[model samples]
Every structure is written in C-alpha cells, then in structure tokens.
Target chain A: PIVQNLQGQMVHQAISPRTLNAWVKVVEEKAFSPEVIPMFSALSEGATPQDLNTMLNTVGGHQAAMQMLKETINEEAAEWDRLHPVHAGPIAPGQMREPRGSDIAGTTSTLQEQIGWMTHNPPIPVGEIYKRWIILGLNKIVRMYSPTSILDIRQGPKEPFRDYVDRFYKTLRAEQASQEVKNWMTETLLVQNANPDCKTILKALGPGATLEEMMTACQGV
Target chain B: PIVQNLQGQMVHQAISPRTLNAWVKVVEEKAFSPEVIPMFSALSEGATPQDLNTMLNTVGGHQAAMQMLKETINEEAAEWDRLHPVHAGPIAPGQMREPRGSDIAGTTSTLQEQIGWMTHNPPIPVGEIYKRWIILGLNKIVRMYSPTSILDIRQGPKEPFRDYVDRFYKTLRAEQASQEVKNWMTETLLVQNANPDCKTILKALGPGATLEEMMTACQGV
Candidate 1:
C-alpha cells in the first residue's frame, strides 16, 4: 500500500530519491513482479537518483514516465553487463529461499535482486566475488524459507482487498517456514498493507481487533 | 533436548566429529548461554575435528574432557587473534540482531561468533573485511529482531523443566519481534526442547493439542 499511500502525492509533489528507493524497497518486499527487479536494481547504476527524479517528475504521466524510466534502466543495465560480464569459469552462499520448497524458480526470483547485484559486485565470475551464492548453481546448501519472505509479502495495487487476503492465505500455506513465522507474517503483512483510510477505522475497532475483524474493516473502503 | 538425546550416547559410543559439529550447530540454536558461543565458534578454528575427536574420545570424563576442550579453544582463539589482529581504526554489515533492541552488548554477543571469525578473515583491518558489519559501531543502519530469533530460542540444560518453561515465557515477553513471531516461537521452541521421552507423549496427545496441553505432556517426564 506504499504505492497507494504515495500515489496521491503524484499530482503535486515531485518524486524524490527516497521514492525510487521505496520502489526498490518494494522489490525487497515482493510487491512488484519479480521480472522488473533487475531493472530497478539496475536503475541506480548509471541513472543517479537525481537523474531518475528529474525524469519521473518532468515528462510524466504514468505511462509516459514509466517508458522513459525503463529505457534508462535498460541503458544502464546493458552498459553494466558489458563492463562486468559474468561468464564464470566455475564455482557460493547466503541468498534467502522461498518457503514452498527448494523449488528453483521461486528461489531464483527470490534471489533475482541479489543476482542482479551480483552482476555489479562480482569480479570475474560466479564463485569468486559472491562466493556465498555459489550454492545456487552447484546444488548444495540447505536454505529453508526465510521469515523475511513472509514480512515481504504485499497486496497488489489493483487487486481487491478480499482477493489479496485470499492470495495472502494461499502464499502462507505454501510456506515451509515454521508455523510461528507463517502466522506472524500473515497478520503483519495484512495489517500493514490495509488501505490508508481503512487503517484508522480498522484500528479504532478495538485494541483486541481480531484478524477477521480487521479483514472486515479492510473491506470497508 | 538434543543434548539429552546425545548425552545418553556418551556412555558407550565414541564421540565423532559430527558430534562436535552438532555442538557447534547447537550454538547456532541458542541452546547455551551467550558467553560460550565464541569458544564453540573457535572450536573448529585450529583443532581439527579429527584432533578434537581424538582428545575427547581419549581423556574422557565429563569434567576432565571439558577442561581439555576449553584449553584447545583458548589456544586456537589466541593464535588466530595473533596472526589476524583486528585493530581497524575504522568501519560494515550482516550480523542478525536480537529482538529486544540494538543493545550493543546483545548485538555483539549475537555476532560473537562472526567477530570470532573476523579474527581469521580480515585481511589487515576491520572495514575492508567485514564491510557488511560496519553498522555495528558507527551508529547508522536499522535492524529489527529477525524471525530467526524466535526459532533460535532454547531451554536450559541444568534448569528444571518448569523452570525453563518459565524462562522461555520470560524470554518471549522480552522479545520485540512481531506478535505473531513471538507466539509461534513460543510454541515451536517449547515443543522442540521438550524432554526426550516426553516428546512421543506430547505429539501423541493429538496433533491439535494446544500449547497448554503440550506443556502438560512435556511436564509428564
């Protein structure tokens, strides 16, 4: 709901560098589709925050602005790749995993940002620089779903409140994180992402408001 | 409980290197007091698993055996510090934080092992090496109690079972982790560290058995 909270500011205020970082933060929060994270990770590379803020604030409707922003991202990323090619001859650790299982695609997307950062951070190849992430290819190292994954879950901008709740529960059931992490994530993410106006009404219900009651309030607006 | 499970093995079997690693793993598990972690972390530093196994399997009575292990850990840690002295005049990241807050002493103890590892990994100074951990001293960076913190809580070895249960609740209350995380950790750690024989009965009371009921079962032994 960070997007919704801030979208209201779009009419008058210029987006700041913090806004760009929040977009990146949302990538960490798993708010955006995983595919675009690399673009965002690459966003800061050549395109400085000042550059991005100017672009977004200037030639800017959502469609017009995003196309410009994305073009810059593509330019930055291409240059970075040319400079630091990741053709590792061979060989890692510490990328967090999805809870569903060791399912590779989920794990890959979860690490997409790190892998994107790896493009910049690595020296010559795979294992040498980010030696910890080597397990991604070689198939050792057991990482269960991280608790952060739960906290990172988010509601979709266009999606209905009920739809997100259903989505939230489905994601929760798929997690193999401890039951404690699972339940905590559901409550925190759900409450945190409630529509901005709905939050006050929701909290005012009572200090003891149940998840179901909170969900009902989230449905109010 | 892993200790209780394995202490039974100490009577007839020779302790293997895996047993030593389990001791190290338990250090990660928060099963022991914070003071002893660096010692355990340093265990593998110089004394090879093979050597530690040889020493433990031979000299052998509990008191005499621990004294030998302690001496080896002390020797290993001292030499490591001598070679890779960490007198960095300045700066870094990535040690997990304790839930209560960023109490420096708590944070340091949490990173005690990594700090112990720093005794080996740093090239010449601090910032260049553990750049990730720089936030510890310079007073920037925000971290919160991780979900992993809940999973890491443990019962005491010498404390009475009820006494430990009281201790677990006290620890749980002190944690500033999300309420959901706090609740789940309570159930998981409490059930996990139950006495060895008490485990079967605890699980058998029906899968739906509540935390209170599970506690009742754990107290049976």
Candidate 2:
C-alpha cells in the first residue's frame, strides 16, 4: 500500500486504516498533487502520507487532522514571535490575506467531515473546542469591521465630483444604515462641516428633514 | 465689431477703448467663438461687450478678470451650498478634476493674469488676500493628506501572493522614506504581521536586513 512507503519516516502515528483511506479519497477528489504529500511531514514528524491520509480519510479523522493543523500553526506562531517582536498591528494595504499550503475555507463536505471527526475525538477540555468555535466567529467579525473615518469619504486629488460621490455611496452602503440615515449621515458628518454654504442649507432644512428635502431646498437656494 | 454688440448690454464698465480694442484683437487671434460673449454678461449686469473686451485685453486685464472670477466663484459657492447641502467632498475616484464651465487650473498666461489682477486689486485687509492664497494652498494640502490606514494595503481577497507582492512594492515607493527603511517597513509593517510563515522567514533575516534579503529568505522558507 502507498501507506507503507510513508511509514519509513515514521509518518503513520495516531492514524487508523479508515482515516488513511478517507484522506486518500479526499486527496484524489480534491485533485491534490501527489508529489507534495511529503512536505506536510516537515511540519510534524511522522505526519507523512499514511498518517495524513489516515487523519484525512477516517470517519473520525477530524481530531487528528486538527491536531496536525494545530501543530503547524503553533510552529508558525513561534517563528513569527521570534522574528517580529514589534510587528505592525494589522496587515498592510495590498498584502495577501491567506497563507500558502492550507485552505481552511474548505467545501461543505470537508467542513462536515472535520466536524464529525471533532465530535468523536474531541480535544482535551471541551472548552478548547468552544474556544476554537469562538475564534472562528471572531475572525468573521474582525473581517467585517474596519476602522473608517468620515475623512475617507472625501474626493481624491484628481478625482471628479461625480466619481467621488459614487465612491462615497459605496462606503455608505457598507455602513449598515438606512438610506435616510445615510443621507443624514452624509449631510451632518461630511457635507455640512465642509463649507459654510453647506451649513446654511442644512440649517434651512429646518431641524428635521430628509436628505431629499435638503436636496430640494438646496436646488432652490 | 462684435465688441460693439456686446456693449449694448452695458457690459462695458471699468473698461477702456484701448483695452476693448485689444480684446477684439485677442478674440480674433485666439479664434474665440463669437457665440459665448453673452455668457460673461449674464453673471454681471452692465457687462457690455466693450467692458468685457477691455477686461480681457487691458494690460491689467488679469486683475479685472480675477475680480470677475472671484465674483462668479462666490455666487457658485452660495448656490452650491443651497442645492447640495451635503455636496461630495473634492472629486471622486475616476472623476474629472474640474467641474464644467470652469478652468480654475489655468495656463501660464491665464495664471499670470489672475495673479496680476489680485496684486493690483487686493482684497480688504490684505490679510484677506493672503487668506485666499493660503486657503488655496491648504486645499492642496488637504487633498494630499488622506486618512489611509496601513491595513488598507491588503490585496484583493482572491489575489495571488506574487501579485500581492508586486502591488506592495508600488506602495513602498510612496512611503517617502529611505529604501532600507521602506524595506524594513515592509517586513515589520506589512509582511511579517501577515502570516506566521512570513514571520519565520523574517526571523531568519536577523536585524537590519533589506527587503531583498527578506525575499531570499522567503524563497527558502
């Protein structure tokens, strides 16, 4: 069996026949290249083809796979801390979002398989599982929220007024606010404060009016 | 002469015959369309053809033109405030720099004419003149200083790592710092914090390494 070749490196620990077969199935189905199976072992000794295939294919392989993943992550984390003691708080503009060699954003079946495995071979302390779940949720939240200022709504140096408005409109959509509220936001937050003329128009809107009302009033003025 | 017809509208105030004649010469030489002379008078009453011609042709015509330009700008400001109380700031991305019917960014002769006019017909307190000048200068400054977070430097969600690195290089050029510092900035500011693997490579580089060194390290890790 191909599992035998992988064992020369002692890369068959913590893996079962069912799991190994399932991993092979996954690799074949997902079209993972054959040549690179050994590379993963570098992250965890004894994590060669047999072990990886077992963790991947077994009905209850999720915990094993997760363990392997955690080891890789831990190694990556340690190296990172050593190199970047005072790293920048967040990723830079135009930087890559995902690292190479892993697709944590897997397909539905893959996700289900992992979940099943996790249910069977639960990590020590159920709290750890909960922590992982929470971390996943938190990642989503972090991705959604970016720190933005009203100043970001301003036009670019060479940009036209119409284009600026369009860009600003896209940002407004992301505000998760109502159109009326967004219009109001634009007025109070960006426009009214920009120029004296804008303030005068806002004042003329008479305390409580919609953006359309303000636009209409502005047209006449 | 065309100037004669323009004067019928009383658009000849603050004008001299010599200047008026000179304007006729300019209009003819510059191939100015005859149709739009009426447009100038609409903004100011009693602005006859002769007056406009004089303003356009006088040795000090730039100052006269500035006075006219200033008047128009003030009117536009008022009307704009009324209509778009929340007007878009500056211009938008992919938009034209100038609005219709205005060429505020003038050519050499035009700029000189306006400056000359300002010098002669200075605004009150002279401070006001300085104030306008300062405001124009400051507008440029504001346009230059956008509120961009380094986090905005991230690549597109599905972008490749190679492409992302290329894009990052462009951003580094705009850092306004030394090459070595910018390379260091990329390590500490963008890449190192991006992935654990990236940090692992960065650590191999030790202190005071250039981006080139980092790239070499990345290739190996």
Candidate 3:
C-alpha cells in the first residue's frame, strides 16, 4: 500500500509539468473549436492593430497548441461544467487563487481527471455544422453550454479498450503539449484571466480576446 | 530526457504519501545538521505558556515546524553561535541582527549534501545516528507549522526529507516567529490559558490551564 501510494504520489507531485500539460491541451483544443473559429474569423471589427499583432504572435508562437485547445474546449467544456460549475462571484483583479488551496479555486486533481475523461471520450460530431448560414446567424445566444464537450460519451471504463484509451490519454497530456498550457486553462485559469491588471502578454488579449489568442498568450506567459 | 524530466516532475508536484516516504528515509539518515536543532530548543524559554500552545499547534504542524520554536530559540542561540563562531553577537535578544537574504543560513543543498556526507561517512560514533536525531528533531519542528496533532506521522511516500527540511526553514520568516510568539504570549496565550475565546472548545478541552494541562486541553478542542 505504501509503495503504491508512493508511485501515485511521485507521478502526482510533479505538478508543474502536469499543470503545464493541462494548459497546453486546453489551448490547443480551444484554438480549433468550430464554435470558436467564427469568433476568430470575425476579429477584424473588434481587433485593434495592437490586438492583431498580439493575436499573430499568440498564434504564431503556439499555432499547434491553439488548434488543440480550441477543439478540446468545444468538446470538453460541457462535461467539465456538469461536474464542476464555474463558481459565480465578484472576484477582484490581480489576486490569484492557486490550484492548491481549497477556498477560492478548484484542485489540480479534479481538473486532471476532467482532462483525462475528455481524452478518453473522444467526441463525435453533434449536429450539422452549417457553414455560410451560421455565419449570417452568428449570435451570442449560442452562449448555451454545449454538451458534447462534457459528459457525452462514456459511462464507465471498458476493459478491452482500456489500455488503448489510458495510454492515449497519458500520451495526449504528456506529448501533445507543454504543462504550462494545461495549468493555465483548467484549475487556476479563471483566476489568472479575471485579474484585470494582469499584463497582456499578447496584445490581442483584451475583453475581446479570441480563443487562439488566449491559448497563445497563456502558453507564452 | 523528456521522459526522465517529466517523471521527476510528476513526483515533485505535491506532497504525496510516496514522495514523503523517500524523504522519511533521507531524514532517517539524518539530513538536518545538529547545528539547527539547538536553536529550536532555545525557543522554549522566551515562549509564554499560551505562545507555547500556539507553537505546538501551529508551528509544530509542518516540517521544521513552529512548535516549541520559542523554546528552541535558546538552544539555537547558544549552540549555533558556540559551534559556528561567526554567529556570536550581543547576548541580549534585541541586539541580534537578522540574517541577510544573500547570506547562507548554513543549510543550502550543497551544505546539506556535506551534512549528509558527514552523517554517512567515517562510520562516526553516531554512525547513522546523525541522521536519526536530525530527523526526529525535524519531525518535532514540523509539528509547529501545522494545527494537526503533534503526532500525525502516517505512512505514505518516501517521506520528503529535503522538502520537510526546506519547508521548516523556508516558511519561517525569522522575526515572524519572535514577534508573533511574543504578542501571542502577551495577549492571548498568556491571558487565555485554558480560557480560550471559544469557550465551548476550551471547556470541551476539559479543565487545564498550565502547559501540560493545556496540552491535554487541546485534545478535546
């Protein structure tokens, strides 16, 4: 039992890397999300010259990452919210609530598990993604949370498929991205972004920041 | 290289039962020097009865904990100065200058390695005992930093010997202890004794006001 716990601890305790991985996954998925892509496309109106410079930097620096998170967030946000709703409250800027302490923020363990589930579930397309028609009808009313991201697929672990899925998830978190990207989006991500005084790492990030820009800025930061 | 670094990172992420076990072994080998122990013992004399309780409750909780820190000060003051020579200063407490940040507290990683070497090499009279004493002392110190019972060593990781040592030293802001203990002794601990502001908890602690009695008093509270 002690040995087993040690093995678990040894893996878990390397939090910085795990945290970084989680953030990267989130950004990569979000950058390429169908829902978020149009938002990126429509950037010319809200985006200032400085914002464009920052956005390009964010994308250029973390192009692969932006794609991964943009997609992951679209598919994973639903399930993530079902289990853990974003706590509603007026939080002040510049004050960070870290992943460890329980009062203000969520735990790293929970976020890790969520990411694991998303990796395992591997979403299927939900509905007909209309192309030019949705562009004309792009509305903030679509703010309703998407379900395919969260609890859509698996109910419990499968024995035969388990090895493949588990190995894939491990490799996914470890290989596809950096740990900084993982940590910034899941557990303490909200606190970091909400901090009004948080210096813009990439200029494209303001109130109107795009998902790609968020992923990029977070990775670089 | 990524695999090895990531593996190390996974272990270092948090204080799990397993990593703790590794540290426990390191501590059992006595990584902390005998030099540090005496100072902690010196802290007892200046501690008021209440401050002593807080020391036991708060400082004693973590590694190199705050507990009995007040009592340990005397031990530290007398022995450290006598052995180290450079530690010599005014006899009165107020005349002592705080250690500068750049200056070594004589317990850096390299120093610790040497200490570890001294503990392991020469097959000295103490043999492995040098490690045991320091580990025991460290365990006692850890008691001060936490509010958990002074006796909460449970099985888990390769107990974090280095981390415990670092935590013990790093968490301490020197004067934070002196000043806080002084005030706690003068105001709360000295006055309250068994008469804690939370009377229910105190009464539940059963009737005892003196140091030993208060130790018992804490069990129920």
Candidate 4:
C-alpha cells in the first residue's frame, strides 16, 4: 500500500509521482469518491502538497496537524455561531463537530487530501475558506501560534498592507477573543499602523465599525 | 537562543509572533546587516513563511533544503550561462560557490528568514526569482523529486491547463535533462495534451518551433 494507517496515527514516506499516477489508474476500479481521495484530489489554498507531504513524515508533525485542524475548525464553528446566533442547521451525512484530535484523523497522504477534507465536513462559510486554509497553513507549516494578545503584531517597514493585514487576521482568529473584542482589535490594529489614507477612511468609518465592516474596509484599502 | 545552528544543521522550534517582533526590535543593535539576516527578511516567491518555518524544523529537511537550494541556484547559474555565454560579470563580496549544504547553514528561526537568504547572494535573474522560489518550496516542503521521466505527469480531469503546464514544466526540469531535451519536452507537453486552440496554433507554427517560440506561443494560448 502506498499509504498506511495504523491505529489513529498515519505515516507517509515519499510518494513518487510515478506511483501517484499508478494509483490513479486504479481509482475507478476501487470506486473511490473524489472527496475520499485526499492525496491526489483537491487544491490546498495555502499549504502546498509539499508542505502537507512533509508534515506526514514527521514523528509528531502528523499529530500536530490534526490538533491544529481541530482547533481551527472549532474556531470557525464558534465564529459562525456568533454571527448567526439564531441560525438553524442540520449536520449532514458526512458532517462532523469540532474534530476531537482523533476525529480529524484518517488516511490522508498528501496536503491536497488534508485540505480537501478540511474544506468539506464543516459549517465553513465556503467564502472565507481561503482564510481558514491559510490559517491552517500558518499553524501547521509556519508553526506560528495565534497571537495571545492583540499587541503581538508588528508592521515591517517595507511590508505590504496585504502582508500586514494577513498577519492581523491570523492573529485575530486566536481562540482567546471575538465580537466586541474582535471589533475592538480590528479597529485598533487597522488604525494603529494606518498609513495616511487608512486613517482618513477611519475618520469617516470611525463613525461605525464591525468585524464585517473592517474586513470590507481593508479589501478596498 | 531561539534558533540553534550547530555545525551544518539548523533547528527551529516554534517562533511566536511576539518573539518575531521582539527580534525585530533588536535587529539594529547587532549592527546586523540586512542580507545577513536571512531568517527575517526577503519574500519567498511562492513558498509561504509557514512552509519555510516548517522545513527548518526537520532533521534532514534542513540539509535537503540546502542541497535543493544548491542545485536550484546552480541551475539558475547555468541558465544564466546559456543566455549570456560571453556575458560580462563581477563576483560580489557576499557571493560563494553553490551552498555546500554546510554552506547554506546559519541560525534561522522562521520561513521569512529562510526566504530572505535564498534571494540574496546570487547571479539570479532577479526577474524569475519567482519560479526559483516556487521550485524551492516544492522540493523542501513537498519532498518532490525532479521527474526522472517525462511520462510521470498526469492531467487531472478538472485540473486547469495552468496546473497541468506547471506539472509539465516541473517534470521537464529534472536533472536527467536540457536545451534539446528541455525544448523537446516543452513542445511535446504543450501540444501533446493541449486544448483544441493549442493544436491549431501548432498547425500554424507546425511550420517551425523553438523553446522561445513555444514559450511565447503558450503565453497567449
């Protein structure tokens, strides 16, 4: 077997592209589902197939990835609940709750596989899947923790606002905060390092701001 | 203390954003130079900071990255040689022969650090630094081997030609290859699995072809 899952742990050695294609030849015979084949299917928005593949070869990296995914999916689920307090929903056939580290487990062999399933089986906003994927990539591949404090951010001299705002959201998603706290930090971070035009916009929007509002505000900024 | 470089190997644990910024605070004190701070400067074309951060954590991954960098920089060096066989040049103060795995070593704490170094100290075509960065990201993070055989590629059913061509070029880049082999694979991959419009262009150019021609032909196609 190109991939082996023993107990709850999975280990992936090198997967040659030739072997990858050989398996593709038999994919139809096994009658596999697209979502079921994480190795070769799906696009990882943030993590490259290389990053995912590298994580699997580690003694502990594999588990770290699962827990990271667990924490992230929970974070997203909580965010969804806050926004849609009264929203009603049903768990589907393959839907899952915040993955209990173990629940996130499976026979994933490639980063594409890891990402495909992460995008699936969630109360994910489909739209912000990009954010979640990058968050996962950051935690798993970059080994960065969510900022424990809003003050953790630093704007580099030459860094693009694109890079800066990205770090902002990644830190914002940390488990410690949200809503009132979220808006508070969002406005603070946005204004704290405002580069001229930013403060001007805020002089107008200060006039009213929410997480949704700030998210949109920056998209234009 | 956070980043340990013992001999040729470097070991990176988790780098908190707080610590990252803290380092930023002291950067000026070491009388430190910018190019020397690979751990904290420069932008990687395609690899995420997370991807860089992760590779540094590995035992062999560290060395793999160096040799990969070594091979890649040399590849670029060769390409540079071909484009300007009689080109005039100068050896810079910071330059060295290809990083001898051992040569690539230095204290590194994060992906940002890794990328910053790679882009520097080279005869690199600053323009295509992107392709090189992505290639580095692929080998280090993905653990992919350069395709030894061109037939190792597969065009996914839903995969865009963008993704397909990326795979084709990656495979074409294998060391087993070059000018004639490179041009041959380029034209073959461009035409072998091309969409209808692609073949039509070939019918017109079937008339004549070269690497530069094929590269230009596909840009519009």
Candidate 5:
C-alpha cells in the first residue's frame, strides 16, 4: 500500500516494502477478499481498517500488519512445501511401498526455506516433519482397523503367505524402520504367537537373521 | 510353432512353451508381423486373422519357424531392452544432469530382463551398457568435439564458471565414475595444466585430495 497526494496522484510517503509484498500475496490468494482492499486503502492513508475485517486477522497497527503478512508468507510456504511429492504420505495396506528416502534426499530451495521457517517457528516436532513427509502417495491411506492377528498363520488364509509377508514388511518399512528393527519385531511376534520352531530356526542364524530368512523359517514351520 | 489336428486345435506336437511365450512378445511388439500367421495356422487350421497377426512372427515349417522366431525373439528382446532408460544413450549437453548411478541402481524387473538379454547376447560391451544408462534425460547429444582443456577452464567462456563446473561433474557422473576416479582425473589434469601453485597446494593435501579441495586449491592459483 502507498500513500498518495490529495488529488490521487503519486506521493512521497509509503508503507514498508515488506508490508506491501505481504498484502499483494493476500490479494492474490484472495484470503480476505474485497475487504482487504479497504484495509490497504486505510493503511495507505496512515489509518487502520474496519475493526471486524482488518489486516492480520483483526490485529491493528502498521507493525502488526507487517508481522501478520510475514507469518502468512511462512504458513503459505509451509503449505506449498507440504504439497511436494517428497512429503508424499499416509501409507496404504497390502502394498510393497518403500520409504521416500530417495525423494526427500534431494530437497528443492523452496522446501529448504519452508523447513527453515518451520525450524524457527517451532510448530510441530522437527523430526515429525520428516516422518510424515516421505510417502507412497496421498491416495493410498492406511487402514484404521486392527489386524485379525499379530501373525495370521492359520491354514488357508484369504491371501497367499507371500502377500502377508509383503504386507508386514511394507508396514514396518513405512515407519522407516530398518531391516534390523524388522528382524527384532519378527522375533518378538514369533515368540508371542507360540511359534517356537520358527523362532528357534531364526535364533540359529544369530543377529544376522534377515527378514527373508525369518520368512523362510516361518514357511518351514 | 506347433503342428495341428484336423479339428483345428492345438496339437500335442509343438515348440517349447518358453519359446512360444518369447515369440508372443516379439509379435506383440511387432518385431515380427503377419509373417508369423502360418506358424499359428499350422497349430490351428481354422486360426483367425487376428491369431496369426497376434502371436510369434513370420512363419515357415515348425522347426524353421521355431528356430527363426527364437532367433527373432533374441534380436527383438535385445532391441526392446536397449530402449529402456537404463540403455537410453548419447545424452545431450547443455542440460544440467544427474549421474546415471540412481537410474542403474534401481533396476526394475523389466529393466533387469533387458539387461539379462543384453548380457547373454553381448550386442555391446557389458561395461558400455552401464556407461550409457546413467543420465537425467537423453534429450541432448554429447559434443563430438574435444573439450578445450582437461578442466575446460577457459576465460570468457560461453557459459559461466558454475555452468562449467556442473557440466564437468555431470559428464563424469554420467560415466558412473567414482569420487576417487574424479579425484584422480582432477589431480592428473592439475599436473598437466602445470598451475605450479595449485599443484603445490594439492601435493600438500596428500593423495586423498577430494574434488572440492582440488577446486579450492586451483582457485588460489
């Protein structure tokens, strides 16, 4: 917003560039609609907008307006960052999906800026930002319901044994758990399910027992 | 190809199922066209136009067609394999690019098969297959002309220093050269160029001079 002469010609005085830029974004996004126009006009005249529909979501004064716009830029930047495929999230059941480690490893400048803003503002846990970001796709949502069993070893299950193995692996993988984490989880599940034979075979392999080896041992059982 | 019965049904006498499936791919990809109709017609006397045009390739006697389709399948499979991004070659210049390391490392099943076929057939050197595969995109062609210098550090160049550095790195990266390889090349180039100060600084850093360190040392010279 800019101040002008009484005749509607250009004038010497104006608001800071920071405030002007923020208002421009506010206008472009149509966040507050036509009401924002008068707010700009008010600011131009060294006055404030209507109390009900003012800048910075009802905050007053030139400084507050500038601060609000800066905050809006940050929030908008975060939203834009969230839209990136690197942040592709919400894992689905029964799909062999991998963590998007490769995707997020290469961050764009915009993403870096957004993450920087998040860092300074301290909105969510910094680590959680990354945990939720990498994903298979937004379309693939994980099931809210619980599984029928910790280990569905019943004869003639609906899906093949291979399919179940894949599902279990992918579920853990979505959590960004390493193969070692999966091995420990498998050992724990095996013991709880009273499959001592499978667990015994896995134990024989020592700490090096892999998911595939564990699966093979279970298959033998 | 298989021999047929009077009832226009598949005969007990036929080529191996493996050979049949191979020809099927060759036909589907149009590597072999209507010429394969007689082969299928032999298997089923009442074969439709679609059937002959559909499976395998051009036909002759059962023995000859099987052998030829088998040969064609190998040839066609090689061609099909080469079309994969892994085999996408002669990468163009001017575009900022990535090393093919990412591309070759994540070989899909289809890409694996193509590579397998290329491996068994040996159309190109086994090493060269990998050399061509890694790139951002195959849109631009590499220049046939030699680089102006080992490091291409010409003054008043067509492109800026950043562009030159990027182009050099990408070219080597596209070759799937290791960081060690790059370091060696950089050292060799520095010595040949006889930038005595740069060489002296590099020697001070010992044999493990990385690309960055080499670049920095060269800057001082």
Candidate 6:
C-alpha cells in the first residue's frame, strides 16, 4: 500500500478548488433536447433522420412519448437549481455514491468538478442525475477490485466494516500524494486506530452520529 | 392526492404475501451497490474526469460515461446481493413528490410484475426498486402541483424527501399494513432518529466539551 515519506510523509499537493463543482455541472446537463423533425412530416413523406429519431430515445424522434419527457425534465431541474443551489451539487453525487478516488476528500473534489461543469452548459435531464449517482458508486467498487490497485476486492458476502476500513486505509495510501499529506489524511481518518471496540461502536451508532447525537454527547464537557 | 377509502382502506395494492420476500431479494441485490457506485468511483479515481467530460458534453454517445458506468458497476452489486440475506419486499410504493397517478392499490401488485420479470431470462437491473422509490416520491410532488398525472416536465432537481415519504406511506396502505410495518421497512434510517438534539449543543461547546460537562450536564433531564 501507500506509506508516507521514508515511512510517513506524503507528497504535498493542494486539490484544485473547482474540480468537483465542474463535474457536477456536466451531470446536470443530461437532459438537453436535441433537434428533431415533427411527426406529421414523417407520416406525409418518408421519415427523415430527424423523424426516425422521434421513434427512438431522441425527442421529436420516433419515440413520441419519451421525447416529451426530454424537453420538460431539463426545464424543471434548471428551475430547481435556481431555487435550491446546494442541491445542485452534493445530493446528486451522494445519490450516485460512486467512489471518485480512495478518499472522501477526493470525492468532495469530484463533486466540485461536476458542479463547475453544469454552470457552463444547460441543465441535464432530471432522472439522469440520479442514474449518474448510482452508476458512479458502482464503478468505485469495481475499481477497488481491479488488478491495478493495491486493494483486495471482496466479491460479495457480508463484509465486516472493520476489515473494509483496513482495506480502505491501504487504498488511500496508494494515492500518489505527498507523505506529509498522507499522514495528515490517515490521522484524519484515524484509520490505523480502528479496533474491535471502534468497529462495534460504529456498527451500533453508524457514521457521523446524528447531528443531534453528536451535539448532545459531545456537549461542553 | 391519494385519499383513503371510506372503509379506512387504501385503493393501492401490495404484492401478494407469497411473493414479498422473493421480490425484496430481487431489489436489494441491486440498490445498495449501484446506488453508491458513483460516489465510490469518483473518490477511487483520484483525478476528476470532470474536465474531459465537460468537453464531451454535447457529443453523441453523450452518455458514454454513463454507459461505461453501467458496465463498471453492475457486476459488483450482483456479487454482494448473493450474500447478505436481508428480509426485504414487504416494502411498497406510494405517492411521489409531484406527479399524481391512479389511487388504485396496485403498488405491490406492480412490484410483483417486476419481480416476475427479473426471475426470468433477461434480468433487468435490480436498481429499479430504488428507482421506483424515487419515482413514486416524484409522483407525490406532481400531485401536490395539483391535477397533474404526468410529471411536470420542467421541474428542477431530483425528488425530495417529503416526496419519498408520501410514496412510502402510500406503499404501506397498499398492503393494508400498519405504521409499525412501515417503520420496520425503514429501520436502517432510525439510528439517526433516536437522538433528536445532539448537534447544536456539541457545536456550541466549541473546542470539544469537558468530560464532566459532557456526561453530567448532558445527563437525562
């Protein structure tokens, strides 16, 4: 796996600020309507390339029903972003749940990238964003199992969280960042600190104890 | 927009008891894995695909990344489903956030059709179960929009939580089930629900709280 400098220091590097935001923006534009010919024209004359599309997934293409959907969904999500901005980013990524890289920090970065992309183009189709989220999460699992990585992928079965954490730590170190940053990152995860006690507690309490639970249990003590 | 029948009955229907367990097996197989893939991949990949993706935005095979993602993710999710034997199914569909559909008690019945479809030759992706959860929720929003059976083509963003709950409740009623059943269906979510007021106090305490201030001051009322 990845060991910091000599033993602990990682290559120091700052993640680009706009990375995740740009990626998110690209996701939002999935619903753009393409130019298509009208159905009436197709019936009167032989169907043109545009007319044939009306029958397909393309709007004004062959499939009349799905096309209507393409037009309206994009408009709605655009309106949605205008009213609820934060949603335009994290929610979609979270829902997709794909691992961008080994660490949470990188996932955050990927989200930033997507958001930036969406800002440049028109909004994507609404349902497409949700699909994007799911597919992305899936890819992460595959990558973990892929031969190129240091990770040993588990092919199904109930995985123990503690074991998973150990593996996750190994994966994180594999990243080509600075050793100093790596140590800080590991310290942040308390990765080496995971024990049966911690695992048991996490299983019982889950991650990021409820905002309410964190507040009360951690109160000025 | 769904109204209860005067008999204190719901018009929506749940899947037959004989098929509930089997159907749950079908869905859980897909949801948890692919559902989280996007987040996992982005983090796992390290460098964001964000910029390259943006340049390709309007190109045909526009959903190339999405298509690659489908291949990338599904394999692992299927593997995981083989293990964890969770008791699923019993869950039903309900109103989404926006669009309104028939008040007929056919949710469970609808699930049965899908389950039947999967048990055969061409298995559809199991993620559809989660898709239904969100779609039905979107439906509730459509209904609230008033007299809309078709989803408003122009709304922005993904489906909201209230929308999910509306369908959640509707699914429960479809089975002519009790609140307890609904709660059980969503038991995993309850961990966060137990502590209603933990976050505020913790944050207000600043540099973490003292031990005495924690256990003592935060003790039972």
- The true-versus-predicted C-alpha distance at residue A97 of model 1, in Å, is 35
RMSD of each: 23.4, 34.5, 26.4, 26.7, 33.2, 27.2
TM-score of every model versus the real structure? 0.19, 0.22, 0.17, 0.22, 0.21, 0.16
- The candidate scoring highest on lDDT is 4
lDDT of 6: 0.30
The CAPRI class of candidate 4 is: incorrect
Off by over 4 Å in 4: A1-221, B1-55, B58-149, B154-163, B173-180, B195-201, B207-221
True-vs-predicted CA distance for residue B143, candidate 1, Å: 23
Instruction: Score candidate 6 by DockQ.
Output: 0.01
Candidate 2 lDDT, tens digit per residue, A57-88?
34343344345555544454455446545544
What's the lDDT for residue A76 in model 3?
A: 42
Write one digit per residue (lDDT tens) for candidate 5, span B1-221.
Answer: 12244654321211232333444444445422333333333443322211222232222112222322333333433554566445355656742222232232222222233234333432332223332221111111111011232355422323433444565554543343257877776566534434445446667776665667655655533
Candidate 5 has a TM-score of 0.21
Evaluation by lDDT, superior candidate among 5 and 6? 5
Rank order by lDDT, top first? 4, 1, 2, 5, 3, 6
**Separate DockQ for every predicted complex:** 0.01, 0.01, 0.01, 0.01, 0.01, 0.01
Error of 6 at A147 (Å): 31
Give the true-contact fraction for every prediction, in order: 0.00, 0.00, 0.00, 0.00, 0.00, 0.00
Model 1, residue B168: what's the lDDT? 66
lDDT of 4 at A24: 32
**Candidate 1 global lDDT:** 0.38
Number of clashes in every candidate structure?
13, 34, 109, 7, 9, 139
Q: Which digits, one per residue and each the tens of the lDDT, describe model 1 over residues B168-209?
A: 665564444477877677656676776555556766775666
Give the Cα-based TM-score of candidate 1 against the true structure: 0.19
Candidate 6 C-alpha lDDT tens digits along B1-221: 01123333223233233233322332234222221222222221221122112211322331443444333334333444454344544554641211012111122224444333333345332333333333333233223333322122221133322223233333332332355754464332212222334323433443433322422332332
- Give the Å error, residue A216, model 3: 28
Tell me the tens digit of each residue's lDDT in model 3 across A115-168.
232223342111112122122222212222222321122212222222222222
